[PDB]
Design a protein around this nucleic acid. Sequence first.
RNA 1: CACGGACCAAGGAGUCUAACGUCUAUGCGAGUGUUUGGGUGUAAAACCCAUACGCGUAAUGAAAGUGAACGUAGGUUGGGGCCUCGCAAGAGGUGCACAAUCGACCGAUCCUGAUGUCUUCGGAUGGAUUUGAGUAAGAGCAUAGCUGUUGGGACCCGAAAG
RNA 2: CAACUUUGGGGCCGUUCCUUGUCUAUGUUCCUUGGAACAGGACGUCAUAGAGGGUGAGAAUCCCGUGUGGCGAGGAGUGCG
Lengths: 93, 134, 52, 51, 187, 52
Amino acid sequence: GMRYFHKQQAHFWKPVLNLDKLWTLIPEDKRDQYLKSASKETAPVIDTLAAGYGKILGKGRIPNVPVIVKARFVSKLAEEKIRAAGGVVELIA
Amino acid sequence: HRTAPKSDNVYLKLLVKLYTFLARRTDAPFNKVVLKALFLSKINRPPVSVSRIARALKQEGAANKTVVVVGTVTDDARIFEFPKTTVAALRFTAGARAKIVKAGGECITLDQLAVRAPKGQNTLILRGPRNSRE
Amino acid sequence: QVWGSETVASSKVGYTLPSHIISTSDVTRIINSSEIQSAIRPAGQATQKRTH
Amino acid sequence: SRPQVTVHSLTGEATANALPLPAVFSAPIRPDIVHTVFTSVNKNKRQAYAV
Amino acid sequence: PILKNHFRKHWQERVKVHFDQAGKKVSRRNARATRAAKIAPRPLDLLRPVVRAPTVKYNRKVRAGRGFTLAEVKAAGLTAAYARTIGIAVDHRRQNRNQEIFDANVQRLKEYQSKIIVFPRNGKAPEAEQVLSAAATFPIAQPATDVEARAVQDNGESAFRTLRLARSEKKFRGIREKRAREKAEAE
Amino acid sequence: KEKIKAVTLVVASGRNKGLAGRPKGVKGKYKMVDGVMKNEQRALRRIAKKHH
RNA sequence: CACGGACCAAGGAGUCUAACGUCUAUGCGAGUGUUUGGGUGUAAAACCCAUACGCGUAAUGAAAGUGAACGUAGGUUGGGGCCUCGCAAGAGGUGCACAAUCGACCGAUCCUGAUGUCUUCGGAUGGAUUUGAGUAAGAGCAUAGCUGUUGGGACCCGAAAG
RNA sequence: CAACUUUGGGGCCGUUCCUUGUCUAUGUUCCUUGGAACAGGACGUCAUAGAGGGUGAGAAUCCCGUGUGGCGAGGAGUGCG
């Protein structure tokens, strides 16, 4: 396509994450209690950026347990699925 | 039609000695199939995920049979629930092993299987996929 | 401590012990289970006789 | 249980204290894997030979 | 398939084969040791600051940087010329543009000045029984960005609309700026 | 840049053989032969015929 | 036909490697890889290790980008093996892997064009086919081995030359 | 303008580095062979010394060294007591 000379491949780190895995980020001792205890006001929060995952993709389905995610980039369906399970997304840069 | 496998894992060879015993004697089809399966190579003994076990358990009239995978067993992070079953294979990943015991079920080796169900009784076999390879 | 157990894992980062693929080394115990001997269709002889 | 072991003195006797095993001893025996490792380790104290 | 050698050239001369590895390691460990016996009570390494790294692929991280700044160390209450002797790096061509980092660095410096004893130039020089790494003693940890548990709050935009619309107006502001120019240049 | 641009054959048997110099028989050109060249050039005549 | 061979000893010719590929063995498994390197030591060994990084778990398009479940992860057929009945022989239910077939989803292409809008932006919803090595509940990482491809001096000796 | 703070320059002995010296245990007992014992057999000893070498053949224990330590001389330049 159109060229931009000395292109340096760091704009394009976009490690994807599907909605499937998404509790391996959480350690087990937290994971089971937060697998139960599906209230609001203990909303287990997730830093995909800290785990090294840039953008969310949706392949999977998730329980209705509400969980908060931090990311930059999302797809529409994945966000809608989150809203259905009662978790919310908050965009960090 | 092969005679004896390519490795020298001694324990597997003892196991195969046993299954030769059964497929010589009893004439079930079951022992033949697992023995033939053990002679395969590693690609052709693919790994089977516990989600696939759960789909097979979700069969009609299938909750109380024992599943068999011949090969190696994986964990799968995707399912969250899992039933409480009696499961047999050669090699168990620890995550999946503990997943099963967390469900409450039992994980066994094939000597223990052959103790319990020699003839292939109340049993069924799975096999993982192969078409993911080019 | 150093090689793990059922109680205490390895003393080592991200390690478990191995596992067996067969519980018991000896097969002949298995074959002389009462249940398998009941389950078996009976033997040959291991010496065939010279016929013609 | 881990069945027991005896313990000995220097001069040697059945010291009355006894230990259980650590369950590595009930871990397997794979001589193919020992051997194919042992080649590869015993190779590693090697230094060059060239012309 | 396409497969690439670079072996067309006279490569056999210029081959460099690291058998030298443990011998070098031992030489090195001896360097460390005798540096210690030269510098006897000091740690073999300086105190180094905490810096948030560049290049958004990495910019979540934080790293053991080079040097505490003049502003930081001034607010700690002590000069470059003294700090460099006390064991403290200083990088002068750096600027402080995050107060969080600023207070982090100065907390690190205060913790240093608390954790030390300084033999003066006068004399008797008590026994001090050295420790051999500043950065181990004064670790450099990624902070807590968030508390583990929260309650949900929503505003109903759902953030895909925001991302799409932000990218769109980013694409179209300059053309909308040209239309604004045309609307301003009308009569 | 453009301006800058610019016989006596001998069957080599008997006495003449192994002489890395000249034989008795002198001329400014000279060419020693043994039978292996006859084999070689026979083979080359064959293969060039097969190349035509 | 032609070429080599007087006679004996000793020497002597598909090897070492780099990047890939298949097959197999082993480990481990949504992961995997300790060895650039730090500590440690009976010292080039052995043992332990964070933080990283690769390769993989997601493609698609030239890009901007966008990013995979209507379902019980689908329907039909076959489908080993199990289960039930059957003295059996046989029937029926289940039917993994796999194959075919029809669909669904993602991406690309064309049209449609909703709540709204710097009134030109956004892109709801539904259609049209053609396409991917996709998805459709993962399978790969590392090593060694037998090996093959190409380059390196390249199975060994040998060539007019600059 | 305001107060505060801090100063160094040698020689001597040890230490350090280098070079070097020197000292730092244990059978040469018996039997057989054979030219000879370092071989074989028996009984012993030492070990932080069984690494190597020699000596009339494979020598821990005949020797030199090694291992662990210590007593020195010469230089250097001060890392500090």
